[PDB]
Amino acid sequence: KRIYVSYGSPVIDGEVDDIWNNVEWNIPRIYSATTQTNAKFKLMWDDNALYVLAEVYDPVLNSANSTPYQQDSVEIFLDENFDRAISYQSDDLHYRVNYNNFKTTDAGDILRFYTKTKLLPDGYRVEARIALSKKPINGTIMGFEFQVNEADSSARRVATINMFDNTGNAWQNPSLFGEIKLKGRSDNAVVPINP
Numbered sequence: 001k002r003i004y005v006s007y008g009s010p011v012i013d014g015e016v017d018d019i020w021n022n023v024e025w026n027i028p029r030i031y032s033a034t035t036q037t038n039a040k041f042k043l044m045w046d047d048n049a050l051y052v053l054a055e056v057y058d059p060v061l062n063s064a065n066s067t068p069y070q071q072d073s074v075e076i077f078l079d080e081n082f083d084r085a086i087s088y089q090s091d092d093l094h095y096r097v098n099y100n101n102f103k104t105t106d107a108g109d110i111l112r113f114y115t116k117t118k119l120l121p122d123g124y125r126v127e128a129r130i131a132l133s134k135k136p137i138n139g140t141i142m143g144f145e146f147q148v149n150e151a152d153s154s155a156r157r158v159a160t161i162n163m164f165d166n167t168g169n170a171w172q173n174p175s176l177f178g179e180i181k182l183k184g185r186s187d188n189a190v191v192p193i194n195p
């Protein structure tokens with residue numbers, strides 16, 4: 001399916017900007033197994049970047065396993081050109097950040113990825129920025145996926161939550177991503193002061 005992404009430019013600090021309250025939560029509902037972990041995320045875009053705000057409810061946080069996706073973490077996938085290829089092209093991105101703000105890339109330049117996390121009672125928040133290589137405009141469509149990895153006290157992933165892919169293959173197959181469509185940038189972006 002498709003998420004419509006509003007235009008805006010948040011501050012990366014792990015805190016919920018005022019402007020994020022003007023955008024809607026996406027609730028990923030594709031669970032690998034039953035768990036009391038759940039998550040939500042908001043998206044926003046500006047001329048230079050896509051922004052993700054994710055909150056995860058997860059009573060046990062673990063990142064003792066040295067394999068990244070075996071820690072409590074979120075993963076963001078982007079098919080920037082909207083090629084929808086079946087394997088990863090040089091513009092396809094797959095990033096991961098754990099609840100301590102440790103970042104990994106499975107695909108794409110990690111210098112494009114900038115994140116903050118915050119520990120919450122019973123969970124964590126991730127606020128992320130991905131620098132875009134193509135100037136986005138109203139109507140731009142990209143492929144996108146969001147995933148949560150749940151780990152437990154044994155230091156292993158026990159479940160995943162996905163927005164769009166129910167097959168376990170987004171890490172190999174961009175055609176499995178959903179779509180985001182960018183809207184809402186005023187054309188006349190010329191703004192006199194007015195105190």
Ligand SMILES: OC[C@H]1O[C@@H](O[C@@H]2[C@H](O)[C@@H](O)[C@H](O[C@H]3[C@H](O)[C@@H](O)[C@H](O)O[C@@H]3CO)O[C@@H]2CO)[C@H](O)[C@@H](O)[C@@H]1O
Nearest residue numbers: 068069070075077094106147149160168169170171172
């Ligand atoms: O027969 C089942 C076998 O599964 C193997 O595992 C792999 C592989 O080792 C991992 O690299 C891969 O990891 C990806 C996550 O599944 C995915 O959700 C995320 O987007 O991307 C991760 C980064 O690659 O996971 C699969 C497990 O599903 C086992 O290692 C074998 O022993 C098993 O037989």
Ligand SMILES: [Ca+2]
Nearest residue numbers: 011013015017
């Ligand atoms: Ca913020």
Ligand SMILES: [Ca+2]
Nearest residue numbers: 079080081083
């Ligand atoms: Ca692509």
Ligand SMILES: [Ca+2]
Nearest residue numbers: 058060061151
């Ligand atoms: Ca956990």
